[PDB]
Amino acid sequence: MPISPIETVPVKLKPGMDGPKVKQWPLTEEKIKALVEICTEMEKEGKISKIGPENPYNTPVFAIKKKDSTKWRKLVDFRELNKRTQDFWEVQLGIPHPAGLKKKKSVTVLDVGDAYFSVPLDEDFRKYTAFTIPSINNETPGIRYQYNVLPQGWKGSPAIFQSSMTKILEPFRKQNPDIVIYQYMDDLYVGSDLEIGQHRTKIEELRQHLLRWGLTTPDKKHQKEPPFLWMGYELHPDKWTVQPIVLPEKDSWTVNDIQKLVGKLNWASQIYPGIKVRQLCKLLRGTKALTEVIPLTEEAELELAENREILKEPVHGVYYDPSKDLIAEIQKQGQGQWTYQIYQEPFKNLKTGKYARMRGAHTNDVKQLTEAVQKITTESIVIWGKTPKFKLPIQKETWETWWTEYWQATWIPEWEFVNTPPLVKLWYQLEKEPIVGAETFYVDGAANRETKLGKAGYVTNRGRQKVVTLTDTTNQKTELQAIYLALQDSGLEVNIVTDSQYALGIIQAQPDQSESELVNQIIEQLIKKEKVYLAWVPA
Amino acid sequence: ETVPVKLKPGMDGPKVKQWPLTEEKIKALVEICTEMEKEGKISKIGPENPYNTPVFAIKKKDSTKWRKLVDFRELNKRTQDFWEVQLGIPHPAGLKKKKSVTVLDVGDAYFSVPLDEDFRKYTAFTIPSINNETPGIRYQYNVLPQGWKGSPAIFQSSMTKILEPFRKQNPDIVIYQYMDDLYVGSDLEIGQHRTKIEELRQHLLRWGLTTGYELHPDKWTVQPIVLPEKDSWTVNDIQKLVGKLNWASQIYPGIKVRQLCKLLRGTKALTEVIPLTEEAELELAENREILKEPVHGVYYDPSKDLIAEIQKQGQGQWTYQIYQEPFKNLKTGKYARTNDVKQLTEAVQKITTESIVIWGKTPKFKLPIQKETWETWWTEYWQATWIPEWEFVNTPPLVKLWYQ
Ligand SMILES: Cc1c(C#N)cc(C(F)F)cc1Oc1c(C(F)(F)C(F)F)ncn(Cc2cc(F)c[nH]c2=O)c1=O
């Protein structure tokens, strides 16, 4: 009902563009009747105003009544106006996370009633919101209106509403520093550590300040009670959790059923520790239609069963205490899966999460662990404005050996070793110098670009030699095949000389996981050797 | 009174994401911005401003106070015609030839000059909110901002008037303005040089300018490609020597490797000792005299961007090359130490500072780090008021070996 006496936000069209001039399609008599009734009510309430014939703009209107109801809705198609309207600043950078909330004695939800219709539209822009209710069979001139408030479906409404609420709340915020107010869409979530009586007094004073600016909110009888159900979460007085999750039991799983399941598992993973989705995600790889049935592999069945067990008993997170440190612990789950928990007091988790190994990468657990530390660090700065102290399953010596030899600059903030197997380690190490009394293999690999045929082989200082033929190969594959040949045919100590910077760079980084069968084959050989020296020579 | 600023046609103002900031940096920024808004330097803005430029908080070189650092890299690229073509500050060739170069921050000079009303919208920045409690605190500039290349370009006439008596009284001192700093070079004895710096600080002080730091560009001698001096030479040693010489054959004209290639005749054991011939030893000595001299045929092309590559050599050592065309080096050097990210930010600042002194422009860096690792931490150790362009590379296994 009220329209805020707040100052308007000046709005422009995109440079070089004029307002929309989209023709109104003739409508049925029942649709015209409904629109006239709706519009007469909005004009009465100050939301829209009748315009003269002068205005050359037009945006189409439609009337929709759902068959279960006898209520008509006015629908305005602002697609053309939105395309011609200036860009606005983004509404929010992120979304509030429950783990980042501090515990409050009392918390109140105040949702603004008819939010957009309570905020005025820039007087110079109103003319572009012009719409026409057509006459019966478009016989005579239609009834023309323009908006005076923020229209539903218009590009600028969310940002202009938000900045209006910010400008309004500003004095109340300055005068009440101990009251927490979260702004989200049409809502205000207000918390305090006052005794219940003065919290209700402060809430009435806030609602009264907002009413002074045209914003209506619910009173004591109508305002929500905990637990608050918000954006897939449950907010209880001293704990939070994700809303109920039911994992369906189907005879046949479709691509759509599996996508829905993976989304629910990912959503539960922010508070249920150990949730895994690798095997279920592998099933979604490919060119498969939404309703196509994908049989579960034994591995996806194993993973689905493990998830059901985790989710069988409800799990909650605690709220944040800004006067304490955040501790993040990470565990290796196998096959590139990593799980983590963040707590302040052991072991009452604020939240949990997971990290997965990058696809098609030659990599090791030290690199995956560094990536997981980085992901957690960034997420922590977003939620709490600080980095946690880490507890990692890697020895200080293993990390020290890694970072001192790696070509890339790498670092982990404050951390301590925690003995939680499986531990993170490097599975082989290249020699620093050529091995004496070890056989030197001068390996070679080449592939013809036209026939795609390759040859991979070696010549040794001891007289040994081999050449093997390969089909539908590349230079890269033949130079990895040549290194693999020397590994297969050598003793426990071997000096290998290659012309490949490609192969050298992969092996030098001590990978132990690869999507390439050939790299994995080389890894198996490297682990088994006692001493391997690898050198590069120009062609 | 204000100088009208136009963007490059076809390009719009910056719309860069604000990177997450810690609570202490946010509190530092809210305090600085509250004070600048009281003074009218900046103003709160509405949502009808769709522009954004990232903002950070760093520790000053002179104190333990927080300072605002705005990343205007995108706005600078989008106004390159104004600050470079329209109002270019010429680069003096004599600056790198000076015994001492002192770097003075003069960024406080710009707060006295109002910004063109129609350009203010492009200087929008946001102070983020922890856990998205509130929408970001949005502001735009009302005066010439620090970090924007149009600022010294506009202040140029005022700076000339400020420096006129000092320059007239000290004709052999070179003063060069780059972004928010003055580079003051002289051939005076260090104590006489410092006295002139303090005298120049008094001149700036009369115009409200209350005042890296001490460089010696004449003592800058490039790190050559180093060939080892050995008593005995294994097969492996000669192969590494050939690889390193093959690399400098593409750079330096006249490098020879025929006689040393002849020594690797066959498929010998890597550990096997090979005696050096008279011819290969002469060839080795001739290559050493070429490597110790500057590269013949390599010249700075002002129409091309400078590129800087850095390699981590272990034990707190880092090497670097500055070039425009790959491997046609304009400068080579080394940096010595702190954690890896701290050492790397320090190397980037040292290399950019030398680049500003030699060419009057910053290089685009190829950083040997993970994008996310660098992006999270670089701000903890940054002390400069400028920021260079950077990208992330996977240092080739032998580019490191050729520059060890
Ligand atoms: C109501 C609400 C909702 C909803 N619906 C959604 C969000 C979302 F932003 F996280 C926040 C939000 O408001 C809360 C805030 C607050 F900070 F925002 C402000 F109220 F103090 N701070 C903490 N909690 C948890 C909590 C619940 C309770 F029953 C009693 N005591 C408590 O501490 C909130 O629920």
Side-chain angles (χ1 to χ4, degrees):
Chain A
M1 297 276 183
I3 299 163
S4 198
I6 190 171
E7 198 186 358
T8 65
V9 162
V11 190
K12 285 185 176 286
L13 293 165
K14 279 177 180 151
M17 303 190 82
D18 202 8
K21 292 172 182 196
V22 190
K23 284 216 181 189
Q24 175 61 48
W25 183 259
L27 299 173
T28 64
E29 283 174 54
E30 67 173 2
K31 288 189 191 284
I32 291 163
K33 182 169 178 313
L35 290 183
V36 170
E37 174 148 353
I38 294 167
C39 290
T40 281
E41 231 35 31
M42 296 182 58
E43 176 184 39
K44 262 159 187 177
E45 285 141 24
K47 302 166 175 204
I48 66 184
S49 282
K50 262 165 211 171
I51 51 169
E54 301 167 339
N55 185 315
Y57 311 112
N58 204 67
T59 281
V61 284
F62 198 45
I64 270 182
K65 177 176 80 118
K66 206 189 308 100
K67 243 302 167 80
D68 77 321
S69 311
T70 52
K71 145 103 144 45
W72 287 95
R73 284 176 231 261
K74 176 172 77 99
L75 187 69
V76 185
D77 186 12
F78 285 120
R79 280 183 296 173
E80 206 56 46
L81 178 57
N82 290 341
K83 161 188 296 87
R84 304 157 175 273
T85 297
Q86 63 164 96
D87 287 324
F88 296 91
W89 179 236
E90 286 306 292
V91 186
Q92 316 169 239
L93 192 43
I95 288 313
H97 197 280
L101 301 170
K102 179 182 195 312
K103 181 151 107 283
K104 294 297 156 176
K105 297 195 173 182
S106 320
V107 158
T108 304
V109 171
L110 295 178
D111 52 293
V112 175
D114 295 314
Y116 298 167
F117 291 0
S118 299
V119 181
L121 176 60
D122 172 21
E123 247 153 18
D124 307 322
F125 204 83
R126 298 177 183 195
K127 70 167 125 135
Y128 307 121
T129 65
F131 67 89
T132 317
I133 297 169
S135 72
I136 298 178
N137 288 298
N138 244 349
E139 207 71 26
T140 52
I143 295 166
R144 315 240 308 130
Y145 288 107
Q146 80 180 10
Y147 269 86
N148 300 318
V149 299
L150 306 181
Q152 213 69 48
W154 177 62
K155 195 186 169 176
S157 303
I160 301 177
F161 175 77
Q162 182 211 63
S163 98
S164 297
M165 174 66 85
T166 294
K167 287 171 80 193
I168 287 162
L169 289 175
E170 186 190 352
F172 189 93
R173 291 195 183 274
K174 273 181 63 78
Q175 296 146 47
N176 301 278
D178 306 325
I179 304 297
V180 178
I181 300 175
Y182 265 68
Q183 285 170 254
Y184 181 83
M185 299 197 53
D186 305 346
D187 295 353
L188 293 178
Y189 311 128
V190 190
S192 87
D193 282 337
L194 297 173
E195 285 302 312
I196 193 59
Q198 47 254 21
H199 178 84
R200 295 162 174 170
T201 292
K202 270 295 154 194
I203 291 302
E204 192 56 33
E205 176 194 313
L206 173 59
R207 289 189 59 241
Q208 224 46 40
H209 166 83
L210 297 165
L211 199 60
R212 211 103 58 184
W213 289 100
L215 304 182
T216 71
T217 51
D219 62 7
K220 265 182 248 207
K221 320 282 248 182
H222 298 96
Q223 55 201 215
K224 297 182 196 179
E225 284 255 30
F228 304 109
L229 302 181
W230 176 85
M231 304 284 147
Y233 299 106
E234 299 201 356
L235 303 144
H236 305 250
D238 45 55
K239 56 187 185 56
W240 71 273
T241 194
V242 295
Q243 281 171 36
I245 290 161
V246 39
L247 299 191
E249 33 198 55
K250 281 173 205 302
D251 286 4
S252 309
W253 289 84
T254 67
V255 166
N256 181 56
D257 295 323
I258 299 171
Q259 295 177 153
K260 281 157 72 206
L261 176 66
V262 162
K264 284 164 156 201
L265 287 167
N266 285 337
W267 187 256
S269 76
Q270 65 200 300
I271 198 45
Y272 286 80
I275 292 292
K276 294 183 195 179
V277 299
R278 181 176 112 95
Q279 309 301 327
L280 289 151
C281 273
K282 281 171 82 193
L283 299 175
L284 295 172
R285 288 182 195 167
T287 52
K288 336 254 194 300
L290 212 70
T291 70
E292 179 188 318
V293 167
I294 316 296
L296 297 196
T297 56
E298 171 80 326
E299 292 81 9
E301 274 296 354
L302 295 170
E303 183 182 87
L304 179 61
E306 199 161 319
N307 286 322
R308 294 191 150 125
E309 173 69 23
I310 286 169
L311 293 168
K312 87 173 167 203
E313 196 122 40
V315 175
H316 68 269
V318 298
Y319 292 124
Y320 171 63
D321 184 345
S323 77
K324 294 200 287 257
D325 279 335
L326 291 156
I327 308 297
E329 298 198 356
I330 312 178
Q331 299 87 38
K332 189 203 169 171
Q333 296 178 300
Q335 318 112 40
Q337 301 165 122
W338 302 80
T339 201
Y340 67 87
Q341 306 83 31
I342 304 163
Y343 61 82
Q344 299 191 287
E345 290 291 13
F347 288 101
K348 306 204 296 205
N349 298 333
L350 276 74
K351 81 178 296 283
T352 72
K354 56 182 171 54
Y355 175 76
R357 173 184 65 200
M358 299 172 186
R359 291 286 324 281
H362 313 297
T363 189
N364 58 43
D365 283 343
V366 178
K367 278 150 91 157
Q368 288 168 67
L369 180 71
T370 305
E371 286 155 20
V373 159
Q374 188 52 52
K375 184 223 194 298
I376 296 160
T377 296
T378 299
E379 179 188 73
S380 298
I381 290 157
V382 169
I383 304 172
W384 304 291
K386 56 196 233 203
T387 66
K389 323 203 310 253
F390 291 88
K391 282 177 164 39
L392 306 173
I394 184 184
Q395 298 277 12
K396 286 269 170 183
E397 211 218 88
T398 310
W399 172 256
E400 187 190 80
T401 299
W402 171 257
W403 87 256
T404 60
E405 307 183 346
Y406 196 39
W407 63 266
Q408 173 176 316
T410 203
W411 186 67
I412 294 171
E414 191 183 347
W415 69 275
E416 289 173 65
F417 161 70
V418 64
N419 196 1
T420 60
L423 304 172
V424 171
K425 60 174 307 168
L426 293 158
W427 291 82
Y428 65 88
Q429 285 177 342
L430 301 187
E431 296 304 312
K432 316 272 177 296
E433 295 299 334
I435 323 137
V436 170
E439 190 176 7
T440 312
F441 284 69
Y442 284 77
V443 308
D444 219 317
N448 185 319
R449 212 162 241 101
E450 282 127 38
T451 67
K452 294 198 195 190
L453 284 180
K455 285 205 175 193
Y458 60 74
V459 174
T460 85
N461 71 303
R462 244 105 120 166
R464 260 208 290 199
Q465 69 90 64
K466 187 166 174 176
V467 195
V468 88
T469 323
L470 297 131
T471 99
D472 293 281
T473 194
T474 69
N475 283 108
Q476 279 176 17
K477 287 156 158 189
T478 61
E479 44 208 32
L480 280 176
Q481 201 72 234
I483 290 185
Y484 181 56
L485 274 199
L487 288 175
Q488 260 180 312
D489 300 7
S490 55
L492 301 172
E493 301 194 3
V494 59
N495 297 300
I496 306 172
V497 188
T498 175
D499 41 278
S500 185
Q501 283 204 223
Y502 166 77
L504 182 73
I506 291 164
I507 305 164
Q508 267 180 187
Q510 302 159 274
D512 81 302
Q513 288 150 68
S514 189
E515 292 239 359
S516 170
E517 168 184 350
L518 192 42
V519 179
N520 273 321
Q521 283 190 119
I522 288 169
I523 294 154
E524 302 167 16
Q525 289 296 142
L526 293 163
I527 289 176
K528 271 143 207 177
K529 301 283 184 205
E530 284 186 5
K531 271 189 177 159
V532 183
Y533 179 72
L534 189 56
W536 179 86
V537 292
Chain B
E1 171 72 17
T2 72
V3 171
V5 189
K6 319 186 178 190
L7 289 184
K8 211 274 170 169
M11 305 179 194
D12 207 358
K15 292 174 178 182
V16 195
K17 263 234 183 68
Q18 170 57 43
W19 240 73
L21 300 177
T22 73
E23 182 170 29
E24 81 163 345
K25 309 251 190 171
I26 293 181
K27 291 184 182 311
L29 289 177
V30 165
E31 206 168 345
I32 290 160
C33 291
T34 292
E35 204 51 24
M36 300 179 80
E37 182 192 18
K38 279 177 185 157
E39 303 172 330
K41 293 176 194 170
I42 71 189
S43 289
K44 278 210 163 92
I45 62 172
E48 89 276 8
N49 186 328
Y51 305 109
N52 202 66
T53 276
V55 75
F56 305 97
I58 59 159
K59 282 298 176 50
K60 311 188 180 174
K61 66 167 180 193
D62 280 10
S63 216
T64 182
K65 275 83 197 178
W66 288 112
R67 80 174 291 170
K68 186 151 80 75
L69 180 60
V70 187
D71 184 357
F72 281 121
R73 280 180 292 177
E74 209 49 56
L75 182 62
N76 286 339
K77 269 143 67 133
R78 292 153 191 250
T79 54
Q80 186 150 337
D81 182 73
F82 178 88
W83 56 255
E84 176 205 67
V85 182
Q86 173 144 241
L87 293 177
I89 293 183
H91 181 74
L95 184 70
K96 61 180 179 298
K97 307 195 219 124
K98 296 301 171 188
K99 209 162 298 295
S100 312
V101 176
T102 301
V103 194
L104 290 176
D105 171 19
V106 296
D108 278 285
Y110 312 145
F111 76 55
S112 60
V113 180
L115 185 54
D116 169 33
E117 248 143 66
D118 298 302
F119 190 82
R120 303 188 178 177
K121 66 184 171 156
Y122 302 124
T123 67
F125 65 90
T126 312
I127 302 167
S129 178
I130 289 151
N131 203 40
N132 297 284
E133 172 181 26
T134 74
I137 304 135
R138 303 265 295 151
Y139 288 108
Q140 81 188 17
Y141 270 84
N142 296 323
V143 295
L144 306 182
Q146 289 167 125
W148 179 49
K149 287 169 181 180
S151 290
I154 286 163
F155 199 70
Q156 225 190 134
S157 47
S158 305
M159 190 61 78
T160 298
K161 302 191 144 231
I162 295 173
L163 299 174
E164 179 277 315
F166 190 83
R167 280 186 170 131
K168 172 206 148 286
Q169 295 163 42
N170 303 278
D172 306 322
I173 297 193
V174 179
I175 299 175
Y176 171 57
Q177 188 174 190
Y178 185 80
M179 288 193 55
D180 301 352
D181 312 286
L182 283 185
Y183 290 79
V184 189
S186 87
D187 287 328
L188 299 165
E189 176 262 333
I190 201 48
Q192 287 195 329
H193 173 86
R194 286 167 184 167
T195 302
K196 294 287 153 176
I197 296 307
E198 183 43 40
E199 175 182 323
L200 175 64
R201 291 201 189 99
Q202 295 310 315
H203 279 95
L204 301 168
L205 190 59
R206 268 59 168 184
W207 302 86
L209 288 75
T210 308
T211 290
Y213 194 58
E214 223 174 68
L215 308 163
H216 294 284
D218 74 332
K219 296 179 160 197
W220 288 352
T221 301
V222 292
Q223 207 260 318
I225 283 193
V226 178
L227 301 176
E229 281 271 5
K230 240 174 293 300
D231 46 304
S232 60
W233 290 92
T234 72
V235 163
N236 186 76
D237 287 333
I238 302 153
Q239 294 173 171
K240 309 206 127 60
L241 181 60
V242 166
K244 200 185 278 180
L245 279 170
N246 213 234
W247 167 251
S249 277
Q250 311 167 328
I251 315 172
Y252 294 88
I255 296 291
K256 303 159 299 314
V257 88
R258 279 179 177 165
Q259 314 304 131
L260 293 158
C261 255
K262 286 171 171 184
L263 293 159
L264 287 161
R265 203 176 59 85
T267 297
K268 297 181 193 299
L270 297 185
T271 45
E272 186 170 314
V273 179
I274 278 180
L276 295 176
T277 67
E278 315 184 74
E279 304 94 9
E281 290 266 23
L282 172 71
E283 189 180 72
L284 178 51
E286 280 163 348
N287 294 322
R288 284 194 219 249
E289 301 163 316
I290 300 174
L291 292 169
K292 81 175 181 295
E293 291 301 313
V295 201
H296 181 33
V298 188
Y299 297 98
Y300 170 66
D301 187 330
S303 73
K304 312 201 289 271
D305 302 308
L306 285 159
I307 296 155
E309 245 194 87
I310 300 166
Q311 301 85 40
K312 176 184 162 181
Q313 303 287 6
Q315 288 82 43
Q317 316 228 270
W318 308 69
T319 54
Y320 69 86
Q321 304 79 43
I322 314 188
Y323 62 79
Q324 283 181 307
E325 282 309 309
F327 322 140
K328 310 297 204 176
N329 300 330
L330 288 176
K331 195 191 188 331
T332 55
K334 82 206 191 315
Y335 174 73
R337 54 146 164 249
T338 47
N339 59 76
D340 268 356
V341 184
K342 183 158 195 299
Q343 282 165 34
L344 182 61
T345 67
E346 288 176 348
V348 169
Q349 295 168 99
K350 169 188 191 293
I351 300 151
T352 300
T353 294
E354 301 180 331
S355 182
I356 290 156
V357 162
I358 308 165
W359 305 286
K361 85 186 199 200
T362 68
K364 182 170 186 207
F365 284 88
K366 284 178 151 41
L367 306 178
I369 192 171
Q370 184 191 135
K371 176 162 172 285
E372 292 72 29
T373 302
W374 179 264
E375 288 183 338
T376 310
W377 297 103
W378 74 268
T379 21
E380 303 294 317
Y381 324 98
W382 206 259
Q383 282 141 131
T385 55
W386 37 251
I387 319 166
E389 300 304 312
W390 53 55
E391 77 189 36
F392 306 96
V393 300
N394 286 287
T395 300
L398 290 124
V399 166
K400 172 172 181 158
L401 265 69
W402 302 323
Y403 285 119
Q404 277 168 349

